Structures are given as C-alpha cells and as structure tokens.
C-alpha cells in the first residue's frame, strides 16, 4: 500500500530524469528492508533493456540485491537477461557480460545455457568474455 505510488510512477515513466529519480529513491529505501523490491520484479525487467548507463546499472544492482535476498527468483529474470545478452546495441550486452558471474552464481541451475550464450556472443561478436567466464566457472568449481 505504501509503495503503491512508486510502481505507478515507474509504469507511467518515460523520461530519463524522472526514472532516475524514482530508481534512486527505490535504492534509498531498499537499503532498509530490501525484500520490498519483490513488487518491482516486472518493473526492473522491461527497464533492463533501456539505453542509459545509469538506469541499467541501477537495474542490475536492484536485480542482484533481490536475488541475494530471494534466490528462488532466478527463472523470473532468466528470459529478460537472455534477451539482454542477445540484444545488439553493444551496451546492454557489455553490461550484462560484466555482471554475468553474479547472476550465474545465484542461479546454479541454468549456468549451462547462460555460459553457452555468453561464449557464442563472445565468439561471433568481437568481445572477449574470457575473464568473466573464467571467474564464473572457477566460482562454480
């Protein structure tokens, strides 16, 4: 109930400034009781494929915090994350590649497809995911 205005602001948001304000505030009161973020699961997804570095970084931070709190939500972010990897803006893909190890670590189930897709993207698009893949697989042991 108290959060009701926030998801409305996000859904009716279409400008970088307002969205950044709402996201910053969301982070502010996420720091305390981060579990509230579970009501933004959809909100973070369709924002995830945006074209702003600050917005995308905040989306990643919130997604990984939500995962750390509730690991059982990996399947929810799996398809959107895969679509982010597949996208061809060469920005969302770079950021997702940066933050690949944490998501796979929290998944523990679909790393088989995650790392495959990351490697294929690295091979055909001239990006080197060697470092990220090595870290993820070392951590998986």
């Amino acid at each position: 109930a108290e959060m009701a205005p926030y998801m409305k602001r996000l859904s009716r948001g279409q400008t970088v400034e307002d969205l950044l304000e709402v996201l910053s505030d969301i982070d502010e009161m996420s720091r305390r009781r981060p579990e509230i973020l579970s009501f933004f699961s959809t909100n973070l997804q369709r924002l995830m494929s945006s074209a702003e570095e600050c917005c995308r970084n905040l989306a990643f931070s919130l997604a990984l915090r939500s995962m750390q709190n509730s690991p059982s939500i990996a399947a929810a972010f799996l398809p959107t994350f895969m679509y982010c990897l597949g996208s061809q803006d060469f920005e969302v893909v770079q950021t997702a590649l940066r933050n690949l190890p944490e998501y796979a670590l929290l998944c523990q189930e679909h790393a088989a497809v995650l790392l495959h897709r990351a490697f294929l993207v690295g091979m055909y698009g001239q990006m080197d995911p060697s470092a990220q893949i090595s870290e993820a697989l070392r951590i998986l042991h």
Binding site: F119, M123, Y124, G125, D128, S130
Partner: peptide
C-alpha cells in the same frame, strides 16, 4: 578459455571470407 575463444572467433572470421551455405553466424542466437 582464452585459447578457445580466440580460435573460435578466428575461425568465425575466416568463415565469412568465402560464401557458405549454412552461414553459422546467425546460429549465434541459439
């Protein structure tokens, strides 16, 4: 992993040099 990715993309680059019938590039999203 470094050697694997290197060989992978060197082969991929060589692929385009001459026309192919399967064109594995589009297989990237598989």
């Amino acid at each position: 992993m470094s050697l694997l990715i290197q060989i992978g993309q060197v082969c991929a680059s060589d692929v385009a040099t001459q026309t192919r019938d399967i064109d594995p590039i589009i297989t990237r999203l598989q």
